[PDB]
Amino acid sequence: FEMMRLTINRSMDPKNMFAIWRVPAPFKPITRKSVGHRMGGGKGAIDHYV
Amino acid sequence: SSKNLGGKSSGRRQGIKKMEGHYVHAGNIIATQRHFRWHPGAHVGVGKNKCLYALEEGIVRYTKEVYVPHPRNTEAVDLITRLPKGAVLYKTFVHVVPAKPEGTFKLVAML
RNA sequence: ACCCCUAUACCUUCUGCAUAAUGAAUUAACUAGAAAUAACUUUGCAAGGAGAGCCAAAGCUAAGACCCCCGAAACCAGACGAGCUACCUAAGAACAGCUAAAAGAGCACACCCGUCUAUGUAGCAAAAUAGUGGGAAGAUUUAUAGGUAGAGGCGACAAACCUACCGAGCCUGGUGAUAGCUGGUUGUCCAAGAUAGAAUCUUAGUUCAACUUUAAAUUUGCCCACAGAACCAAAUCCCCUUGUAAAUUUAACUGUUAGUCCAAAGAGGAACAGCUCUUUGGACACUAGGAAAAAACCUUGUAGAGAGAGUAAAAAAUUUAACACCCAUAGUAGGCCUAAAAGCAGCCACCAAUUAAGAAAGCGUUCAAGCUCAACACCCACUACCUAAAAAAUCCCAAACAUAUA
RNA sequence: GUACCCUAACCGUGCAAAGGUAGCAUAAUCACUUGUUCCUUAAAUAGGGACCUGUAUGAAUGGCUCCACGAGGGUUCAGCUGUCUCUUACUUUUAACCAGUGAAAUUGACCUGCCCGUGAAGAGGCGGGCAUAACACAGCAAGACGAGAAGACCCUAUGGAGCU
RNA sequence: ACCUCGGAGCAGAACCCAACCUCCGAGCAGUACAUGCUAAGACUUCACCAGUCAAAGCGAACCUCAAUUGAUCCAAUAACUUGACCAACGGAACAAGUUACCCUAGGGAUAACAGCGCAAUCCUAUUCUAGAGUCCAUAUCAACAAUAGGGUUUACGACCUCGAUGUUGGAUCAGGACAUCCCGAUGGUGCAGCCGCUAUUAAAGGUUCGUUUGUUCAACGAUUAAAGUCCUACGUGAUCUGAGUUCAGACCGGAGUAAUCCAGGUCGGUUUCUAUCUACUUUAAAUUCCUCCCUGUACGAAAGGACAAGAGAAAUAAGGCCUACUUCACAAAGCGCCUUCCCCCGUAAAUGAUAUCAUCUCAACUUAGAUACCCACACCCACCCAAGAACAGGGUU
Ligand SMILES: C[NH+](C)c1cc(NC(=O)CNC(C)(C)C)c(O)c2c1C[C@H]1C[C@H]3[C@H]([NH+](C)C)C(O)=C(C(N)=O)C(=O)[C@@]3(O)C(O)=C1C2=O
Ligand SMILES: [Mg+2]
Ligand SMILES: [Mg+2]
Ligand SMILES: [Mg+2]
Ligand SMILES: [Mg+2]
Ligand SMILES: [Mg+2]
Ligand SMILES: [Mg+2]
Ligand SMILES: [Mg+2]
Ligand SMILES: [Mg+2]
Ligand SMILES: [Mg+2]
Ligand SMILES: [Mg+2]
Ligand SMILES: [Mg+2]
Ligand SMILES: [Mg+2]
Ligand SMILES: [Mg+2]
Ligand SMILES: [Mg+2]
Ligand SMILES: [Mg+2]
Ligand SMILES: [Mg+2]
Ligand SMILES: [Mg+2]
Ligand SMILES: [Mg+2]
Ligand SMILES: [Mg+2]
Ligand SMILES: [Mg+2]
Ligand SMILES: [Mg+2]
Ligand SMILES: [Mg+2]
Ligand SMILES: [Mg+2]
Ligand SMILES: [Mg+2]
Ligand SMILES: [Mg+2]
Ligand SMILES: [Mg+2]
Ligand SMILES: [Mg+2]
Ligand SMILES: [Mg+2]
Ligand SMILES: [Mg+2]
Ligand SMILES: [Mg+2]
Ligand SMILES: [Mg+2]
Ligand SMILES: [Mg+2]
Ligand SMILES: [Mg+2]
Ligand SMILES: [Mg+2]
Ligand SMILES: [Mg+2]
Ligand SMILES: [Mg+2]
Ligand SMILES: [Mg+2]
Ligand SMILES: [Mg+2]
Ligand SMILES: [Mg+2]
Ligand SMILES: [Mg+2]
Ligand SMILES: [Mg+2]
Ligand SMILES: [Mg+2]
Ligand SMILES: [Mg+2]
């Protein structure tokens, strides 16, 4: 999202161009377990959103 | 970790025990249900766990009928009296069509 | 005879072994399924049968036919052991020479021990040899007898030593201890035969179910037509026909209940794993052909002989980047801002002369100045395929071949 | 909390039976750790001296010095030397050949090759290629997951035992 | 951490369906007092036990809730009835630690090393062009992100092996990859020269000695042309070592009532093998540094300061020999002496079409661009040897 926003905001002409998202903000949560953890022991904590 | 506990209960084995057209004797349980999915109709009684059993001996038929609750059933009457005009509720009902007559008159004496 | 072609010993264990997992040199001999309750079969007699006792609403009597071998560490009882060693008792013995002459003193033999090294490791030796060392008149060393014994002794505690495996000696007995664990389990031939699950000091086991096997009795069993199964996708349930021949019940038991990949729907993990967990379905643990070798992918199953035939599955194809030429004065250093910002720092407008040039699309200048594009003319004509990598460790890996009618 | 950092002679508060005293101190000492500084060496995670709530030192769980002593552990001057740079020569034993006597562990069967691939995942034996008359003697130790000891670690067992 | 019971998802539509999977709860409360008796037919948590609904009838009247729970024996009671956080919840009536002093039966059904799978982590290359670099993306570095590759780390998995696959560093011997540390060739530069930085090609040859530490590493000293990165069962213990690490002894600090323990420190501590099979046991072209001159030349304002060509001197490596030296002595050796010879491909240019210019050309085309050793062969009884384990070989005029 930052790549899209920065590239389009830099390259666009704000006097004759306009841009909108057709994709919502990151909402689906992705969880990661601790580094080096063995298999099992519950589901990992929420890391980020996509 | 895994701080979720419980949720180990088995399946209740509920649902339909007698489908369409099945010959059913008196007192046979037709359906077992946790909520009112199928309603009792003609010659079908309901037991306090909301089970459905046959009151007569015959053939099980599932129909779809209009729903008029008892005027003392407060929440159902509230839903009725908040429904818009021109609309009617429909529910699935279970009936037993009795196959045999109640009895016969036959000759026993020649007095 | 070899040379050609085919061909990954056996047993056990396992999801799966050519496995570089187990066992086996070989020969001969020895070496491992014992029985009840019932059931079934065949007789005898029969509302009774049996040579007392017992059973009997067709039973009773008799026979047949069914249940292995080896192995612990252990525990207890009674003996035998202190000729080794631990400590003790009785009475003995040895300790050269030198320092100083007193010493649990020093050097140093005999003697006692065993620090370090090397050799040895089925040895000379079930702890040795060689050198090097600690002590060597003392808490020393040692010969002889005797004592203390295992629920114990003895110990300058190393949980050491008690007749060469002492965290509890050895022998005999109980004893053919026990082993949900490993190993093994011996003629021939045929047939049926593959894994829902629940409990459990249970997950290396067992019991019940499920599946499987046999023998009986009976009538429906699989495939399924329409109608039908709830509010908050693939399908399934139910099911008459029809295609078929199996199903249920009764009797009697074992064994399997430590599971692998592939396709699909998901869950956990990294939208990792030849990962783990469920579900549907295949195949494998059974044969054969193919994908190189090959478990699980594809083809195909019911058995034999043939020097016959038709087939199934079955052999990877691809090779990519040329792009113009010629030209350019000028209203103006458009206005504002700034030291200047001149088409090109930032703003407003974007008109307008020449035939034809944006109040300038890139560069370039502190700013300037400069050079390219868009524009005239010029002319054959914009010629326009719209695409894109490379690495590892013994030695590349069939040989090869674009062109003779499917 | 209090004297620029640090640190509190000091003040306040709470608990305990008492709140670690003297001494020593980076230790034969949890982590920090190769603590900081000086000596020693050309060069020091070593050794010695010093500082140090040692945030887990410490007083017969004995604390700290000290004389002798130690096959105890560590450092070092000087010398010595095949320890090494860097190995060489000789003798004896061993060795190898002739003669006599004559074991053991091991051993499914073997007519017992190399490369790459495959596969119960590390092939002499399977696939594709390569190599290839037969047979002794000496040597080597890369492989035969070489031999030995039903793994000395780990787990399991409604298996044991010793100790508290 | 959990162990029993229930609801929702996973499991969308008959039933069922797991995970140390994702969430929510339960171990009651309230009413009644016919919450009496009895009895067809059914359901069923995949077994059993347990659990669930109920027509009719007698007698009266005219239960809510989702789980809300515990078997048998036995105990209390005259009887009816009532007894566990038996929560390890199908429950043994009542039993903890520790073991490195340990033992047994097994397990690669299960961990540690090694192999394998995977690549999260680690490493590399490209793509994009923000940004840094006075200006300038692309001399050099590089954000967000994308694509692809490697199998050196730490994991993760539990597939071979527990009727043994012995282990960290070191010695010895090294085989291989190139992602090159040096030497070679080339392109770019913010390359004047010397030095550099970056990229392409190149694996023939090379890649030091020491102090501390058991160390791999790391720091430091002194050099060198350089002191490469890896893989090879973290190559290599039937070739060696045993400092470390994880047996039995002991100490310190801490923990524990104690036995004992510490993924803490410290001192000590047995490394067996006679080779059966495979494999192998003599394959002659060497690299590098330094000195001189070129030359104080090119270049540069100066300071600084080359590349070619050529000459010499070494060092190592390979092969060999004893004249002298030295260990020594009919000889074997080094510390001594002698000899050692080809290229190597990145690219830079000329002519010239497709495309009548140009263009180094996956256009046709032009240029930069080995020899040596060995080689004959029943004299052989025997002797000698500079030949040799035996055998073989050479000499015996
Ligand atoms: C080889 N040594 C260092 C050793 C090591 C271990 N531990 C290991 O296996 C550790 N190895 C690792 C590092 C984990 C790979 C060990 O476990 C052992 C031993 C030694 C043996 C000695 C045994 C001895 N016998 C069998 C030769 C013996 O007679 C006695 C005795 N004193 O009587 C023993 O103590 C002995 O049986 C023994 O205990 C040993 C080990 O257990
Ligand atoms: Mg559930
Ligand atoms: Mg369940
Ligand atoms: Mg296995
Ligand atoms: Mg096979
Ligand atoms: Mg083999
Ligand atoms: Mg084995
Ligand atoms: Mg085998
Ligand atoms: Mg085994
Ligand atoms: Mg017992
Ligand atoms: Mg005696
Ligand atoms: Mg004395
Ligand atoms: Mg003395
Ligand atoms: Mg002791
Ligand atoms: Mg002890
Ligand atoms: Mg037995
Ligand atoms: Mg059959
Ligand atoms: Mg259990
Ligand atoms: Mg078991
Ligand atoms: Mg699997
Ligand atoms: Mg002494
Ligand atoms: Mg002999
Ligand atoms: Mg292989
Ligand atoms: Mg040999
Ligand atoms: Mg074993
Ligand atoms: Mg058990
Ligand atoms: Mg049931
Ligand atoms: Mg009634
Ligand atoms: Mg339990
Ligand atoms: Mg239970
Ligand atoms: Mg100990
Ligand atoms: Mg054992
Ligand atoms: Mg591993
Ligand atoms: Mg910039
Ligand atoms: Mg598994
Ligand atoms: Mg093993
Ligand atoms: Mg074996
Ligand atoms: Mg072995
Ligand atoms: Mg390269
Ligand atoms: Mg290794
Ligand atoms: Mg070896
Ligand atoms: Mg031991
Ligand atoms: Mg010692
Ligand atoms: Mg050895």
Ligand SMILES: [Mg+2]
């Ligand atoms: Mg062999």
